[PDB]
A paper describes a structure:
We found that adjuvanted protein or mRNA-LNP immunization of rhesus macaques with ApexGT6, an Env trimer engineered to bind Apex bnAb precursors, consistently induced Apex bnAb-related precursors with long HCDR3s bearing bnAb-like sequence motifs. The primary hurdle to eliciting Apex bnAbs is believed to be the low frequency of bnAb-precursor B cells possessing a long (≥ 24 amino acid [aa]) and acidic HCDR3 that can penetrate the glycan shield and bind to the positively charged surface within the Apex epitopic region. We designed a slightly improved germline-targeting trimer, ApexGT6, with affinity for additional PCT64- and PG9-class precursors, and we evaluated B cell responses to this trimer delivered as an adjuvanted soluble protein or mRNA-encoded membrane-anchored protein in RMs.
Our finding that RM018 had a binding mode sharing features with CH01–04 bnAbs prompted us to revisit the idea of targeting this class of Apex bnAbs.
Residue numbers in the entry:
A (entry chain L): 3 to 9, 11 to 27, 27A, 27B, 27C, 28 to 95, 95A, 96 to 210
B (entry chain H): 2 to 52, 52A, 53 to 82, 82A, 82B, 82C, 83 to 100, 100A, ...
The structure:
Amino acid sequence: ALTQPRSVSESPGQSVTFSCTGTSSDIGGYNYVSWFQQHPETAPKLMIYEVSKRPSGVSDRFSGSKSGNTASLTISGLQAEDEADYYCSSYADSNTLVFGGGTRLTVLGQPKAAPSVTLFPPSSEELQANKATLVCLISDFYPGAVTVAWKADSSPVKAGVETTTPSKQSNNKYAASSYLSLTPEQWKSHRSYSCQVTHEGSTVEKTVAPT
Amino acid sequence: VQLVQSGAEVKKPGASVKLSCKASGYTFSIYAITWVRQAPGQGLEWMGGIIPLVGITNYAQKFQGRVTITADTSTTTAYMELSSLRSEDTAVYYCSRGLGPSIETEDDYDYSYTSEYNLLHVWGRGVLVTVSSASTKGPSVFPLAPTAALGCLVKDYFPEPVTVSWNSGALTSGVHTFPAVLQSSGLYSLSSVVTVPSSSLGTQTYICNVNHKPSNTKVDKKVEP
């Protein structure tokens, strides 16, 4: 099993802990529970091993514990560099290795910045190809969590929408793009289309028309 | 000390992929090597491992029959071949070496296996294995015509990546190159826009250079109001 909280957030300088729940043969069965820190696009790094050991080079902030079938990873004096996913691991009967889901630790080290949304209609050159792709671009916002909803004539439309996951920009902001793929007939069948991006309760709307 | 992993590999469904994990800086045979897989935007997954000296393999039931972990100590390299590849098998493949040896001479110079050590300490850079039936295809660049904003749409291309540069590398201010989106057709689509003065729309010509090494395609596109 190795169930973990989906994500955890805290302020810098404040302690933060993670939970790692398991069965009798997973965590409580053996004292080989270890925690890993993985930054995006990088290999995971071992922070704690054998439940509470801390391999050489790990800052004394990280500390592992265990009480029954649940382990815990605690990061006191939380810093910005501690922003990454954390996984727990543990041996199991039958000579097996089990992993946890992973917790997304975010340090609120930046002020709230609303997203910048631009909407592009299907290009006539693209329409000649029998494809009407609406491109919605979100950039320069923090924290990197937004929700995008597509409206056609103020009516919601969830058909054929794919939105990329937010990433890290050079300025430590976040970026994301949403594409509404319509047929040429559909793009012209509605007066206008809207791309609403909601960020921290604040929502921004940008609309286009076939014109 | 190090686990040198292979490059990047892309395979069709039903095919086979054999990954290699070459170690340096320690005695290869005694230390145990396990393979951990992490699907894009997903949690780590355990596959198996091997002790090279005695060639003992321990697989995960999720991969029994397909995965085959081996090792040629002649070259201190361990190989994990996954057969019957699937679109769902796309993921980043890691190999890790334990903190300490899994086999030890004990006096009487006979061998003695250590006990259930930690086993994930030294990681390799990882290899991406994108298993999909989509074949190599060049992008179709479409202009996104226009404080004014304009950009290029790079649609229906495969596989990664495509490099976009405006004015053949000249314009490099206020330019966002968003991540690509993998659609249900299996072909990535990417967008790139710039922020330029409204007055210069009719005076400065903006060209986006799209390059795609996988399909040996280079495109130059002009965006005008």
